[PDB]
Amino acid sequence: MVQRGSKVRILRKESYWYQEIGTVASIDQSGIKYPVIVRFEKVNYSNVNSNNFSLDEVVEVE
Amino acid sequence: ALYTHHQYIAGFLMVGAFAHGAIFLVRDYDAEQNKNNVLARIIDHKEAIISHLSWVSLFLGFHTLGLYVHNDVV
Amino acid sequence: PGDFLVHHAIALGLHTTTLILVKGALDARGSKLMPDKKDFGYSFPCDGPGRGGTCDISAWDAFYLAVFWMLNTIGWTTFYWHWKHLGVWQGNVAQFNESSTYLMGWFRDYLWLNSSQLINGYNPFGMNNLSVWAWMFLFGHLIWATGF
Amino acid sequence: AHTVKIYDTCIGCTQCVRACPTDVLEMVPWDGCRANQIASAPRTEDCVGCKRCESACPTDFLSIRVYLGAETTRSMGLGY
Amino acid sequence: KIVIDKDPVSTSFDKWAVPGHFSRTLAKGPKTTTWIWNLHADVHDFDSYTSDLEEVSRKIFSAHFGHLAVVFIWLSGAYFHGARFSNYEAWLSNPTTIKPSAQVVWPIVGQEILNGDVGGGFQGIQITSGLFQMWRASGITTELQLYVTAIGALVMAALMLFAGWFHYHKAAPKLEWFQNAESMMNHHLGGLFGLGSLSWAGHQIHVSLPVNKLLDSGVSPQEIPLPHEFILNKDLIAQLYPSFGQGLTPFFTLNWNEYSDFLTFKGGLNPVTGGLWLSDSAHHHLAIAVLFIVAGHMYRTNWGIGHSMKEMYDSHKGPFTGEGHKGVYEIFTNSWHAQLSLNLALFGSLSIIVAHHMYSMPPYPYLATDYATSLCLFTHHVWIGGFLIVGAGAHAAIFMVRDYDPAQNYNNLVDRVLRHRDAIISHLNWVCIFLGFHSFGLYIHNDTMRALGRPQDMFSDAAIQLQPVFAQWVQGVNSAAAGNTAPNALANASYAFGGDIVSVGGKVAMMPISLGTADFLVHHIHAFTIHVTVLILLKGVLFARNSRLIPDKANLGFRFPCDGPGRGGTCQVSAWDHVFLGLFWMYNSLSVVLFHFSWKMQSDVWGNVTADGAVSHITGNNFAQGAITINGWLRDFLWAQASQVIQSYGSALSAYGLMFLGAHFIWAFSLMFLFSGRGYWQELIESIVWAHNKLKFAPSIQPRALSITQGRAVGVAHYLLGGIATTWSFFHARIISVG
Amino acid sequence: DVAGLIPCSQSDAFERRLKNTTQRLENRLKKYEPGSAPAEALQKQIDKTQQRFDKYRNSGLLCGADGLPHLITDGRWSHAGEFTIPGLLFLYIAGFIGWSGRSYLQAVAASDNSTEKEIIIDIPVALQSVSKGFVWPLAALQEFSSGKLTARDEEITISPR
Amino acid sequence: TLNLNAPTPIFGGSTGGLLRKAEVEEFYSITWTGKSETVFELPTGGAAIMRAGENLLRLARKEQCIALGAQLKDKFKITDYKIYRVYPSGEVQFLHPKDGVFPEKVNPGRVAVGSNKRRIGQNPDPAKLKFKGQETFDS
Ligand code: CLA
Ligand code: CLA
Ligand code: CLA
Ligand SMILES: CC1=C(/C=C/C(C)=C/C=C/C(C)=C/C=C/C=C(C)/C=C/C=C(C)/C=C/C2=C(C)CCCC2(C)C)C(C)(C)CCC1
Ligand SMILES: CC1=C(/C=C/C(C)=C/C=C/C(C)=C\C=C\C=C(C)\C=C\C=C(C)\C=C\C2=C(C)CCCC2(C)C)C(C)(C)CCC1
Ligand SMILES: CC1=C(C/C=C(\C)CCC[C@H](C)CCC[C@H](C)CCCC(C)C)C(=O)c2ccccc2C1=O
Ligand code: SF4
Ligand code: SF4
């Protein structure tokens, strides 16, 4: 279980920020798949900084 | 004409060697079946091979060009 | 010392051509730009203008850039074979000795000095048996420039 | 026709639909939640393959993909 | 009506800190490295971020002051280096023998071998800019007059630079001060062009003509009185052309015939120098002034009399063309780009007209015998002119994307050209293919005929003749025109059409450039290469908004790389990419014009004259039978005349040899950007960010590959720089040695 | 004498390059006025030539049949000043510029706006990294031993497999 | 329906439109009501004038209809554009709005065509689907 503000590492192998550190901005309090919103320092090639991940793709390195 | 014949073919054969290995990796390679062998380890540190090939390309070309431009100007 | 500088140009060519060829070999299955490059095949143009624009991204186009590099590497190789032997065969080894150390002697004393009797294959006073080569010389310039 | 497949990491952002120049895409309600949406491509025969729907998807490595298949007269974008 | 605003912009350094301050897209910080190139791309494009035409035009006005500053700064350096570091004083005593020179090179690592034996007791770089011949025609005899002019340009440079600060930060004019085109046309015609040619006509009479009358009598540059003595001492202006003793009473009483000795119509070349007669050019700009001052009283202002350009276009409409020119005035007083493109078209079209009128009618004394300068003066202004014509097709395309309004343009002359553009482009498409076959294929035929031992089947002068009869006739009506249809002129408009050989020193100043079978071929190569250059640029203009392929190409922009790989692939569809492709074709077109010029003159025109009168030219009349085949273009021009740019190592011409090979590099380096694409490098950089992220020091400004539009731009920039600077080095090292 | 290369003090082809370089400048001097300003710039050029032939004769270089000084990199200590000694002199200077820009970026990245400080360079932090850059052959030794010179591969981003 | 005949805008021009492809198979027509007599750019060349209308325009491509249908929603705010594709020498009537509403708006009763119940990193290798009729993205 990840909470907001927690510094996570992404295990989604397709992501631009795979195996990189980001801070969770929020989690969605419903049963929606991919609820974990992580904000990253580094922008991807579409110059965005957020994505929706699941709890299986993140860890709790804090 | 005989040296220049086979060397230009050898370049075309050596480029086509890496070309058909590259076709193997899209079509025929299966990373769930091929794991922990020599093949699935070279893919595992492929950034280490390209960047160290990015150095020796850039190490020679910075210097043997500058060694020529030195000898030109001088 | 002239043979020193060419072998490191050659070693630059074999390393760079390998660099392009093992780039698209190992990155044929995905990168941070296009992670699903195995879903699109070996030969496909691009993934559009999105994600910064992905021209020449495929594993086919890494072959395609290294064909310029092998022609240049064998071009470095066989220019060095030919001009070294053009002084060996003519008995004047000193022309490759002093002029090959700097790139103007490579230009003046190989491409300019030796292409004189070729380029007089057909002058306005006659023609020789080299006029099939002087034609195919210019024929080769025209087809090369058309690829541009 | 080019194949357009929409993956489940879509968020109902509606951005790829309004960036389509040939009106291929549309929004549809989702089964398991019945509140959020997803894009859908019921008119893939109209798809020219411009990949403008991938330039508008906000998810990291976009939820809608375009695979350039066989080229008909519509997908070639021919006025003749 | 002058209307301004008082202090709209403060003079602060708060925005000097932040780069990218002007736009909402920038100044947030570079998250990637494209921002470093996004900043330098859209700075001087004021129209994008600022959405007020009043604010946009104030930026444009005060910026030309900054460009006026850098020209004056550059002009002072032309005058300072002629004052300090030149042999201008020794050159006036012997102008044929001594080579013109400035730019002494410092005694460091070996570049003091470039300070060569250039003439007299001076050592420096033999320059090819013609400033020595321009300052002699201006009358300058000592270096003090050059030194004060270098100071005079720097105070003028500060004057323009202060005026750009003042007219944006302090007193910026409103929009209505800029939209007054009739008062602007009135002022620039009579004031800038008329008084500028009236006041320069004053210099050529009082200053240039007296000192040159003694210089062509050949006394000394020291014995000649200073040019203020020709204003003060009226006895001194009476011993040479004694019509100054009557004052301005021939002028006001219309008895202008008394000025028949310093306002002539002699019209030839000076037999002592080989330049135009200065009394012709004195009479010239005086006649140009009155035509320009009178024409500046044409357009209407706040005094009722005068033409209105809005009502000349209304009721200039025919039955073919619908609503006529109705709307082109309102387009031209609102679009800054349509004003830019048209003023760029006829600035670059003029710059080639300047080149053609200056080798054949050499305006300056000892410019014609200076073959080292007359070729570089031709090849410069041709090259300057072709860049500006590509900027015409560029900025006409930027007009179409955001300044074109369909509501203002219904059935006018912009609408009706955008409605039959498929008829314009395809008929332009055919006439290139017709000209490419029937001009280049006549070289391919002549290659194949001379290769196969069939010299009687090619197109030559001793073969199937293609004589240029429409140009040889015009050579006849202009060589026999002095005395019959221009009866007051003593000699012809030029010696290029027909006339004697003017021989100044031992060398030809000018001689009749004949036209033959080869000249038919190259002038149709020129007709072909221009028509393709038009075809790429005009396709970019007419299809800048839409096509059958992309119907919303103006919604995507003037400068975007592609609409994707769909519709078969839509790479290089935008209006910017046609400007990018036309740059090579402009490079392709102009480089043949300069190859045509450099060998036409060396074989048929330029050369030496013996003591009897026979001419021996430079390359020895080999343009007639050599320049009809591509092999003769390779063997007798590019191989035979680059024998001075490569045998120049170890001599004073060595920096031409180094610029030769050094520009072959940058040309060939450009193909790395042109032939390849971006998405290779963006995954190659992903291996280099890894090898920097491994040692924990990867930069926070994330490295990106150059964009698709930038990679095209950085490849065309090094392409032109690589080939022009090769042609720069080949031309300079050749004609300095033989001419 | 390592590859048939005679030393340049007894190499006659090298001593003949001097005879033709000054003869190509004395004939360049023979036409000018003797007290003039281009005359003294050629004698400054003639004597600059004599200061490179006497500099290469006494340095013990190896001249071939052409008469030009050849360099010998296998590194021998009798020929150590060709590549080994300026190569060591190179490697400290390049590693100084290398470790300075690496120490600058690690300090800047743990701040509020890291990308801002790459554009406008903080002269405190820039001159700090010069102080941390002069000690780099010592500083990298305890940096590599501490484990914080490199990163493990679970911390770097990496393309999909 | 298409309501042909409907008045063409007052145009008279455009080489660039509706050539021989239209008479054999598949041309398109966009129909709208323009609430003025104002000028608008065509995808062919630029002007016509929109009628009071019932305005109709026969275009060559569907891509040219949505480009014009975007201009009427942008510049004139007339979003009532209703494109078609013709009969016997054409294919399919009533192309847009396909379900009585714009595709960016949600409408129940639509079915998710081309949906995938997986991510893109969960796509199989092509070697697993080699020598089969399955493709590496279809489900
Ligand atoms: C014996 C070795 C060998 C074999 C069996 C193959 C076989 C194959 N290759 Mg490989 N390849 C080879 C060597 C080989 N290649 C070499 C030496 C290179 C480097 C040059 C390559 C680089 C390569 C690439 C990049 C690709 C292949 C592909 C293929 C596959 C399809 C080829 C095809 O249909 O193209 C059709 C054939 C042509 C279009 C031939 C035209 C090109 C020639 C060179 C034109 C010659 C110019 C002209 C005639 C000269 C005139 C003279 C002048 C004086 C006028 C097939 C499996 C493709 C594939 O997808 O694999 C699954 C593919 O993308 N090959
Ligand atoms: C000297 C005092 C001074 C000061 C403090 C300012 C301050 C300002 N000016 Mg002003 N201005 C000045 C004089 C001054 N100006 C002058 C002399 C001119 C006439 C050129 C102008 C005309 C002007 C315009 C049109 C605009 C400004 C603007 C500005 C504001 C932002 C500019 C900026 O931050 O970029 C600083 C820019 C630079 C440091 C680059 C200067 C480039 C110079 C002029 C030419 C360099 C080319 C040179 C020849 C190099 C060739 C290549 C080289 C390799 C050889 C800032 C308040 C902008 C503004 O107010 O936006 C709302 C704006 O649009 N100024
Ligand atoms: C030297 C290389 C080269 C050649 C031959 C061409 C040729 C052409 N370009 Mg291309 N172009 C080039 C470089 C070249 N370009 C480069 C480097 C670029 C990138 C900037 C471009 C970008 C470009 C643009 C943007 C455009 C062109 C266009 C054209 C065509 C002009 C129409 C014409 O007059 O054809 C005449 C044909 C010739 C001069 C070829 C000579 C061949 C002889 C006469 C006939 C052949 C002999 C024989 C019959 C062969 C058949 C026998 C065989 C089958 C057995 C022509 C095909 C334009 C176009 O297509 O508009 C119509 C156009 O708009 N090109
Ligand atoms: C001198 C001498 C010697 C030595 C020799 C040696 C030892 C050699 C080696 C050699 C070698 C060392 C070689 C190698 C080569 C290699 C190559 C040729 C490579 C290539 C590769 C490739 C091309 C790959 C590809 C691929 C990929 C990429 C992926 C997957 C698939 C494949 C695998 C296909 C001796 C002892 C005898 C004695 C004395 C003399
Ligand atoms: C002596 C000699 C020689 C030899 C040499 C050799 C052979 C070497 C090798 C070496 C090697 C084989 C090495 C490699 C290495 C490896 C690695 C692994 C590396 C690493 C590195 C790093 C990691 C980096 C760091 C840094 C620095 C150091 C500085 C700056 C900063 C930086 C961070 C960049 C010769 C004969 C030539 C010559 C004579 C002398
Ligand atoms: C080589 C190449 C690149 C790679 C080139 C890049 C990334 C440019 C980077 C090179 C410059 C020189 C980096 C400059 C870095 C610093 C500014 C250096 C500062 C040094 C100071 C001392 C001045 C592309 O991105 C590309 C894209 C599209 C088509 C072709 C190409 C292409 O050919
Ligand atoms: S484009 Fe992709 S991310 Fe955006 S709404 Fe459509 S499916 Fe979702
Ligand atoms: S430039 Fe990029 S988007 Fe355009 S066609 Fe090429 S690969 Fe596709």
DSSP string, E283-342: HHHHHHHHHHHHHTT-B--TTS-SB-HHHHHTT---SSSTTTTTTHHHHHTT-HHHHHHH
Q: Which of D51, E675, B47, E578 has its CA nearest to residue C56?
A: E675
Query: Which residues in chain B have Cβ-Cβ distances shorter than 8 Å to F159?
Result: 46-47
E270, E264 in Cβ contact below 8 A? no
Block residue for tokens 């009598």: E217
Residue G20 C-beta-side C-alpha neighbours within 13 Å: 0
Terminal-residue alpha carbon distance, chain G: 37
Tell me which chains share at least 3 CB pairs under 8 Å with chain F: A, B, C, E
Element at E625 (helix H, strand E): helix E623-626
CA distances from E426 to E5, E438, E550, G60 (A): 51, 18, 18, 20
Task: For residue C113, give the 3-state DSSP assignment.
Answer: coil
CA–CA gap between residue E705 and residue E679 (Å, rounded): 8
Q: Between chains, do C51 and A46 touch, taking CB under 8 Å as contact?
A: yes
Q: Between chains, do E658 and B54 touch, taking CB under 8 Å as contact?
A: no
G123, C36 in Cβ contact below 8 A? yes
Count contacts between A and C (CB, < 8 Å).
Answer: 15
Q: Which of E530, E555, E553, E533 has its CA nearest to residue E543?
A: E553
CA–CA gap between residue F1 and residue F63 (Å, rounded): 10
Query: Which residues in chain F have Cβ-Cβ distances shorter than 8 Å to E117?
Result: 28, 31
Q: Between chains, do B22 and C28 touch, taking CB under 8 Å as contact?
A: yes
Q: Does C46 belong to an annotated binding site?
A: yes
> What does residue E607 show for φ and ψ, rounded to 5 degrees?
165, -165
What tokens appear for G50 in the block? 């929109």
Give the alpha-carbon dihedral of E420, E422, E426, E428, to 10 degrees.
Answer: 50
Q: What angle do CA G100, G103, G106 make, to 5 degrees?
A: 85
For chain F, how many helices (H) and strands (E)?
6, 3
Say whether the peptide bond before residue E551 is cis (omega within 30 degrees of 0).
Answer: no
Say whether the peptide bond before residue F113 is cis (omega within 30 degrees of 0).
Answer: no
**Ligand 1 contact via B19 beta carbon (within 6 Å):** yes
Residue count of chain C, please give it. 148
Strand A50-53: give its sheet, edge to edge.
Answer: A7-9, A21-26, A36-39, A50-53
CB under 8 Å, gap of 24 or more: what pairs does E427-431 form?
E428/E531, E428/E534, E428/E535, E428/E538, E429/E535, E431/E531
DSSP 8-state code for residue E403: I
CA–CA gap between residue F93 and residue F81 (Å, rounded): 17
Q: How many domains does chain A have?
A: 1
Task: For residue A26, give the 3-state DSSP assignment.
Answer: strand
Q: Between chains, do C50 and D61 touch, taking CB under 8 Å as contact?
A: no
CA–CA gap between residue D18 and residue D55 (Å, rounded): 12
CA–CA gap between residue D22 and residue D19 (Å, rounded): 9
Residues forming beta bridges with residue E616, ordered by sequence position: E608
CA–CA gap between residue E381 and residue E369 (Å, rounded): 19
Expressed as residue numbers, the domain containing A49 is 1-62
A45, C48 in Cβ contact below 8 A? no
CA–CA gap between residue E521 and residue E458 (Å, rounded): 12
Q: Between chains, do G126 and C38 touch, taking CB under 8 Å as contact?
A: yes
E551, G68 in Cβ contact below 8 A? yes
E594, E359 in Cβ contact below 8 A? no
Q: Between chains, do B27 and G128 touch, taking CB under 8 Å as contact?
A: no
> What does residue A38 show for φ and ψ, rounded to 5 degrees?
-115, 135
Best to test chain B binding among E687, E690, E693, E694 (most B CBs inside 10 Å) = E687
Query: Which residues in chain C have Cβ-Cβ distances shorter than 8 Å to E687?
Result: 23
What tokens appear for E686 in the block? 């992903």
B50 → closest Cβ in C23, C42, C77: C23
> What does residue C126 show for φ and ψ, rounded to 5 degrees?
-175, -160
**Ligand 8 contact via E569 beta carbon (within 6 Å):** yes
B32, G125 in Cβ contact below 8 A? yes
- Tell me how far the alpha carbon of residue E160 lies from the centroid of ligand 2, in angstroms: 13
DSSP 8-state code for residue E192: I
CA–CA gap between residue E545 and residue E398 (Å, rounded): 10
Q: Is the dihedral of CA E540, E546, E551, E556 positive or negative?
A: positive
B49, C22 in Cβ contact below 8 A? yes
CB under 8 Å to E582, separation ≥6 — which residues? E390, E393, E533, E536, E537, E540
CA–CA gap between residue E684 and residue C20 (Å, rounded): 9
Going by CA atoms, what residue is nearest to atom 16 of ligand 3?
C148
> Residue G3: left if φ>0, alpha if ψ -120 to 50, beta else—which one?
left
CA distances from E238 to E202, E232, E245, E310, F111 (A): 17, 12, 6, 52, 83
* Atom in ligand 7 nearest the alpha carbon of residue D10: 8
Q: Is the dihedral of CA E370, E373, E378, E381 positive or negative?
A: negative
Find the helix packing angle between C2-26 and C60-88, rounded to 10°. 160
Q: Is the dihedral of CA C50, C51, C53, C55 positive or negative?
A: negative
Q: Which of E137, E156, E188 has its CA nearest to residue E69?
A: E156
CB atoms within 10 A of CB E672: 15
CA–CA gap between residue E309 and residue E332 (Å, rounded): 11
Say whether the peptide bond before residue G54 is cis (omega within 30 degrees of 0).
Answer: yes
Q: Which of residues 17-56 of C touch E (CB under 8 A)?
A: 23-24, 27, 31-34, 44-49, 52-56
CA–CA gap between residue E549 and residue E568 (Å, rounded): 10
What tokens appear for G31 in the block? 């129909």
Best to test chain G binding among A14, A18, A19, A52 (most G CBs inside 10 Å) = A14
Block residue for tokens 């299966």: B30
CB under 8 Å to E101, separation ≥6 — which residues? E86, E87, E118, E119, E122, E124, E125, E126, E127
CA–CA gap between residue D19 and residue G112 (Å, rounded): 18
Find the helix packing angle between C2-26 and E678-693, rounded to 10°. 100
CA–CA gap between residue E443 and residue E461 (Å, rounded): 14
CB atoms within 10 A of CB B68: 18
Task: For residue C123, give the 3-state DSSP assignment.
Answer: strand
Return the residue of C nearest to A16 by Cα. C32
Block residue for tokens 């062919």: G44
Q: Between chains, do G128 and B29 touch, taking CB under 8 Å as contact?
A: no
Q: Does C55 belong to an annotated binding site?
A: yes
D75 → closest Cβ in E549, E566, E570: E566
CB under 8 Å to G95, separation ≥6 — which residues? D23, G28, G62, G65, G83, G84, G85
Question: Exposure of E45 by Cβ count < 10 A (0-12 exposed, 13-18 middle, 19+ buried)?
Answer: middle
Going by CA atoms, what residue is nearest to atom 33 of ligand 5?
F99
What tokens appear for A52 in the block? 């929706």
Query: Which residues in chain A have Cβ-Cβ distances shorter than 8 Å to E700?
Result: 41
E542, E417 in Cβ contact below 8 A? yes
CB atoms within 10 A of CB E56: 17
